[model samples]
Target: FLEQTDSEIFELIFEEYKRQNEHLEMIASENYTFASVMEAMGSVLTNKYVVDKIESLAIERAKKLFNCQFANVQAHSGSQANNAVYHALLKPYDKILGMDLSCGGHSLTGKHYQSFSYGVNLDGYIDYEEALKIAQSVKPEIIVCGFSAYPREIDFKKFREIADEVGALLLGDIAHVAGLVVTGEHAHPFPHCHVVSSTTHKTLRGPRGGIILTNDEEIAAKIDKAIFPGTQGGPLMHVIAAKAVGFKENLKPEFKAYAQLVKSNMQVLAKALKEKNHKLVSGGTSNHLLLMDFLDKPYSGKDADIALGNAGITVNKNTIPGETRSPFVTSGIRIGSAALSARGMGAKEFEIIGNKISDILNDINNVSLQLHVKEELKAMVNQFPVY
Candidate 1:
């Protein structure tokens, strides 16, 4: 029995669990889903009628959460959903406008679409005037308004105005901020956006999936067809069951509290890091995540990332705006507080973590300090039981 229990596959799973429990998971794009979300993941929705029933429930819940007139809770991912929106709306090689990959915008580059672009300031904030000028000059058919690395609030109203001026469809990809939008912690992409796309995971705390929302029934019909016949095959109905549960959870008041706490913790972490002489993208964060710029520092983003990992913290090395380094050896590290917030970490906890993270980066050669911080992180993880 012990031999079977110690099988390499099972052993690795246990090891991963221990690693998660023993360290600080600061990855911005990751989180722990609720028990209910997991409970519904495996379902017998292989039949047509049952699948429709459960998936319809998810659709209704999503529609209510975002107050959209229509919702399509399928496509399997944010990218797929984004592509579907483009498929339903635009023809081939339409002008796509968004921030470049390194500048925090979702760059849909070199697909069937060849798009013109503009640049964000070094502060990493999108220049509305610049974008408008570019839109006017290039006449993009669709303008994507959302980001993976942007740390401040986006001007959705201004983007809509620009989109209208240029006769373009404004697609708001709220995949990164879905839960925040659901809980009123972030700006709503609806009411103004022509078409919106989001992943069901991230801040949504659901099973992994994608959704498309819209106020236009004609556009909604096109989206449905694009997802089914125009793009992917039969939907993953089992995931739909979980998304239904997740939608229910998002509507509850507790998720709002969690979203607010996440915002507060990020501010605390950013402030603490600044106090310890670290510079964040855009000066500071107004949301659940911040990008740490490593340009002026002696070490690369890779060095800071590895140093933090050695000290029981996990983060991804990312490309800074106007990056000259290769993707793998980038100029920044992106840290988030949502997962830690889900683990019940507050501002006070991240304030301490921020200082420790700064110390790890500042003194990368200090093995003793790294070990001490790792021990402290383990203690924090123990206090926060995700299981």
Candidate 2:
């Protein structure tokens, strides 16, 4: 048993959880899990150290939820799940093609600075014609379709066709848009790719965990072995239990509607931002995220993020499609609608919040207006009461 803590640090941590719970969360890769899901994580299942039973249950539930033939839910994070796929399918030096990091791909998906040490033959996004040309020339073992930063729908069918042409397997990393895909708000990757991977927390509104799904039985067996022996030791039983709970919640009809709302709110926010004279990367979004090119505005992404935080709005600084600034001090900000809509803020609230965001940024030096907007954000968030 663990002892209770009365320390100031513990109190501060709890307070901060509340603070985050009561704000507009626009960060693209974040979301609030269900109350029951959190309860499952905090349950007595944490006492277990075994791998098979809870892990199998989570995997089965995930497979049913996603309408896939097989699922692996033991991976602690999306990166681990992806690595499991790599271990099962490719040699250390095998060639792989993915979108560039600045163009919305995850670090694990082949940005050399992040993956070079792993010994992958990483290639970045080329134009469609050039991409097919390279696919034929290099004959890559795998092609990854998905992005961490892109806001448009990926052509999974096209990737599959290219993969077939090059004798390569197509892997769809739907981590950024799992909820939208599952609810039919975005296109499904299954039947178009050999495998799909995602985290349970982001748009799925579940616990923090990763899951892999495939329709091929042979690939499923290899994935299970890879996740079990090639990568992880004992799985986190409590988190798996939480994932099961989250999957169950996601199976509901209301959850599908909520996922659609997530997409709608993103379009609403994107339109409002464009109307304010700010340019959104890719013109607009088909999913839950949009990237704003802050270079067109007076403030940098970092400065705008800080100013938005001052107004009780949360977002992240991210690199543009072809960034010219450092990652830490990027010239673009990525925003989403997951957490804000989770707080029950629909298009109407999003419109108001968008104008407030525009007002604060247009007057970045006006602390008074920032503070006033902060209070307004607080009031609006209070009406929802997440807890």
Candidate 3:
């Protein structure tokens, strides 16, 4: 009925559906959620405000999934979740420390807080000792851990120690790896991080939204108040219900296997690229994502990204350590296996796609080759439908 009433919006959405079906979605922060979650999201509760069993169930499942004592499933996005955490914990202009955005992390608390940033080492790894020194000097009120494009596991334990030394609260944003964290494929942020925030869409495969989790009762209360009367109004009940459904999927045994496939596929893809003489940051990846460094190559990250896009793949240009180019045109491309893994692509598939990527980038200006690869990859994409 609505499709008939608003054909423009419906046509745009249809085009998006077609586009998703035809492309290789490799963006680290994107995923294809379950139809069950979609059904929950498109329910009658879209018009309703919360204070029901739906949101209550979502909170319970979130607590169980993250192994935290309290959860607030009200924040609109991951950035907003970080904002709510800051609102709950800090006064205006209070000190905050986070990973540098150039190194694949972002700071939503920077606008109001005295935001200082720590960066990765030359080898593309977090320098904990150096980070500790910065913490001692900055004496930030909060220490934020996690990243948008880092390929290694976070040492949450070490971060807790730094926070302890500086008497700062540790905040973990696991928005990018919550799927693996829940499956024990990655380090758990809890029992070490005082509070954690995440987006529901990326790795968790939920509807687009955010959640705040904590073990401290006082912090939990503050987070709820910060989200409700402080920062936002009237939670999206449909999304809350969808979050509940997604949590149920993540709690399953099959989801654990899917998480494993994500990591394993990444390793396969990384190896394939390395074998093709592509330079990867830190040599390779230990997680679901990797960065292809193009600094030494003739092409920039933007060159490789556009080439891959022409070949029916979707990846983003990202800045590497000691980047020389602009953010709009970076030195590297960030690729991930999660979205394609969600489409049931495994090591063999990743290997082929990796080689395909190499072919496109090895001859960056080959328009006909790009068109050929696009059709070949679309056939492979058709073999593993996202829905």
Q: Report the number of the highest-lDDT candidate.
A: 3
Q: What is the Å distance of residue 91 in model 3 from its true position?
A: 1.0
Pairs of colliding residues, candidate 1 = none
- The residue-by-residue lDDT of candidate 2 on 124-206, one tens digit each, is 22345556776786777888878887778877888888889889898899998999888888888989999998888899989
The TM-score of candidate 3 is 0.95
lDDT of 3 by residue, 187-282 (tens): 999899999999999888999888999999999999988887523455677888999999999999999999999999999999999898999988
Instruction: Output the TM-score of candidate 2.
Output: 0.89
* Per-prediction TM-score: 0.93, 0.89, 0.95
- Model 3 error, position 266 (Å): 0.4
Instruction: Predict model 1's lDDT versus the native.
Output: 0.85
Query: Between the candidate structures 1 and 3, which one is better when assessed by TM-score?
Result: 3
lDDT winner, 2 or 3: 3
What is the Cα-based lDDT of residue 314 in candidate 1? 89
List where candidate 2 sits over 4 angstroms from the true fold.
1-10, 50-53, 101-127, 229-234
- For candidate 1, the 10 contiguous residues with the lowest summed lDDT are 100-109
